[PDB]
Amino acid sequence: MVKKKEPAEGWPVVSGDYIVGDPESPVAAVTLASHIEDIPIDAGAAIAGPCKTENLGIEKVIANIISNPNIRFLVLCGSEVQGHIVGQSMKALHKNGVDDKRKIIGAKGAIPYIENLPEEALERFQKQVEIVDLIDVEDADQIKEKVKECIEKDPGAFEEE
Numbered sequence: 001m002v003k004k005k006e007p008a009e010g011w012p013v014v015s016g017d018y019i020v021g022d023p024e025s026p027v028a029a030v031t032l033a034s035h036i037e038d039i040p041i042d043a044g045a046a047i048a049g050p051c052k053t054e055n056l057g058i059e060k061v062i063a064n065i066i067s068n069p070n071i072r073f074l075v076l077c078g079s080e081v082q083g084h085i086v087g088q089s090m091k092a093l094h095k096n097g098v099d100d101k102r103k104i105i106g107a108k109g110a111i112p113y114i115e116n117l118p119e120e121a122l123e124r125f126q127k128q129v130e131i132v133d134l135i136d137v138e139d140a141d142q143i144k145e146k147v148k149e150c151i152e153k154d155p156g157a158f159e160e161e
């Protein structure tokens with residue numbers, strides 16, 4: 001009975017390191033430095049993978065989320081990537097956006113620049129999903145429960161006015 005739309009053709013469009021799950025699940029999971037991509041998928045996520053860079057890696061994540069309107073949650077889990085600091089950089093990008101040199105405002109990551117996505121693609125990212133901070137948590141029971149919680153709170157597919 002929840003509202004679902006069809007994702008872009010050949011989704012996920014952009015090559016990367018991830019596991020695709022249910023394309024209609026509302027939840028995406030970035031595992032960061034950790035190797036736990038399976039745990040969110042077996043709790044019924046749409047897509048889960050590591051992300052180790054605070055620029056190109058982040059751009060690939062966003063491009064592959066916005067192309068599926070069913071996704072309304074982005075879990076950030078697993079150990080933080082030392083120096084790159086991808087987790088905290090992404091939180092900052094969601095909340096603050098980018099400055100006019102395309103630097104992510106507030107990000108502690110060493111080279112937090114989004115060179116390749118346009119502005120409209122970020123605004124969409126900020127409106128489409130909400131962020132769920134489980135950074136430096138690898139506990140399975142925890143990650144599973146948060147993913148099932150999001151599924152229970154599925155607002156359905158996104159659509160701009």
Ligand code: B12
Pocket residue numbers: 014015016017018028029030031033047048049050051052053054055056057058060061062064065080081082083084110111
């Ligand atoms: C080249 C490189 C950087 C480069 C610059 C490149 C850059 N972009 O900033 C430089 C040399 C500057 C660098 C420096 C060091 N690095 Co470095 N670096 C790398 C390397 C090779 C990057 C990997 C890469 O280019 N990946 C391409 C992108 C696309 O990969 P990705 O970020 O993971 O993105 C993935 C996701 O987007 C996913 N994906 C795609 N779509 C979707 C959708 C969804 C929903 C999801 C979930 C996922 C997903 O697919 C992508 C993979 O193809 C890695 C090695 C590695 N094992 O990955 C180390 C790595 C990131 N280095 C890291 C470290 C430690 C550093 C340093 C901090 C080390 C030091 N003390 O000097 C520094 C300094 C940081 C800094 N920037 O100043 C470590 C992290 C260790 C840790 N876990 O704590 C790594 C893993 C190497 C290692 N094993 O030691 N680094």
